[PDB]
């Protein structure tokens, strides 16, 4: 396939990718920016804590109506939330990206996450029933995921 | 064209709905029902002065 | 309607004939662009209604 920002030391960087996975886009974007640049030891350790609700994910661009929380003071921000299923699938890709780092023969604990893109997928449609016998649509918003992992030299 | 630029049958809703005053086909279920009927500016309308 | 006449049981016999999916060898022929049965009918949503 093709990635945005094909890497600059390509033999010394492993990559992983996900397409058409049923989650919410706007939740998966904000947790990608929390990830971006963090070491993969800490990328494992941070996303266990979001599912344990011990450490937040700040909502920076898609902020409408998110309540305040205590733990956005690690991020210089007010509004945080604790997405399970964003963290469930984004912890998944890091083990797939660990798996590719194994096969190419890298030093897998020098790996930082260089680039991570999350962009909307062809959305699947359902319908629900409002008043007066008027259908209004009720649709998913899945997202495609890419990531590039580059050694800190 | 000669005929069957508009085989269809439609009358217009008019006022109390926010749409427009193009004729709209009569029925339901089949999702052409409710669309724009004959005239120039519609899908499946006739042309302007159908050539003779 | 749980007790009925014979004309309906001939009509209902054919509608269960129609109502089975596509085998996986017609799908792999030559001269083909059928992907599924579009005339497939499910009894909660779409009644036949005689």
């Amino acid at each position: 396939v093709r990635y945005s920002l094909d890497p600059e030391n390509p033999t010394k960087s492993c990559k992983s990718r996900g397409s058409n996975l049923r989650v919410h886009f706007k939740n998966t974007r904000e947790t990608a920016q929390a990830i971006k640049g963090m070491h993969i030891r800490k990328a494992t350790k941070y996303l266990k804590d979001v599912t344990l609700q011990k450490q937040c994910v700040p909502f920076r661009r898609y902020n409408g109506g998110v309540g305040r929380c205590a733990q956005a003071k690690q991020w210089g921000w007010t509004q945080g939330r604790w997405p399970k299923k964003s963290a469930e699938f984004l912890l998944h890709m890091l083990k797939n990206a660990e798996s590719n780092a194994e096969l190419k023969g890298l030093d897998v604990d020098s790996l930082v996450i260089e680039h991570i893109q999350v962009n909307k997928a062809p959305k699947m449609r359902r319908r629900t029933y409002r008043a007066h016998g008027r259908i209004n649509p009720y649709m998913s918003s899945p997202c495609h995921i890419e990531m590039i992992l580059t050694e800190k030299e | 064209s000669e005929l069957a630029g508009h085989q269809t049958s439609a009358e217009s809703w008019g006022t109390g709905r926010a749409v427009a005053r193009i004729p709209r086909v009569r029925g339901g279920g089949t999702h052409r029902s409710g669309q724009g009927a004959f005239g120039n500016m519609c899908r499946g309308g006739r042309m302007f002065a159908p050539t003779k | 309607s749980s007790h009925k006449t014979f004309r309906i049981k001939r009509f209902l016999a054919k509608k269960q004939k129609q109502n089975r999916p596509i085998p996986q060898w017609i799908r792999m022929k030559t001269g083909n662009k059928i992907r599924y049965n579009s005339k497939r009918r499910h009894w909660r949503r779409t009644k036949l209604g005689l």
Partner: peptide
Amino acid sequence: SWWPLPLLLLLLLLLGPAGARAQEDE
């Protein structure tokens, strides 16, 4: 392998107009 389900035709129906008629100005 199975064909995608649903996505059936709508069939919009008539609904009440001019909200609560109420009383016209006079």
